[PDB]
Design a protein around this ligand. Sequence first.
Ligand SMILES: CC(=O)Nc1ccc(CN2CCOCC2)cc1
Ligand SMILES: [Cl-]
Length: 115
Amino acid sequence: KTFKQRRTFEQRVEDVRLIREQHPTKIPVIIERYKGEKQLPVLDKTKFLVPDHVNMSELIKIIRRRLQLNANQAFFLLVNGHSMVSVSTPISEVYESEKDEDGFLYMVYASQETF
Ligand SMILES: CC(=O)Nc1ccc(CN2CCOCC2)cc1
Ligand SMILES: [Cl-]
């Protein structure tokens, strides 16, 4: 059901390697809705190629636009399983410290802080 359950470790490693070859300036990001989530919709896809210069604040704005949220819908985003310490960090720096061993950066979103 989740991305890690659908694709083998070997398969995830090879897809990150192909994104390095074909989209060298992009961060490979997995974005999934929290399994408990009621309010927010699901995304149109799972795997996202994020320009490596954007910061976490801008990525949140990007995901809010993709979900077509309105101003008063709450949105919380975990990176590698935990809260972001700072939204100002360039995603290239976030990737180097928070990437999975498969080479993806994993994110989860919910309408509540308590996931
Ligand atoms: C596109 C891409 O990133 N490819 C890739 C392929 C293999 C590795 C693993 N290497 C093998 C040779 O040296 C030891 C570690 C890393 C990256
Ligand atoms: Cl690129």
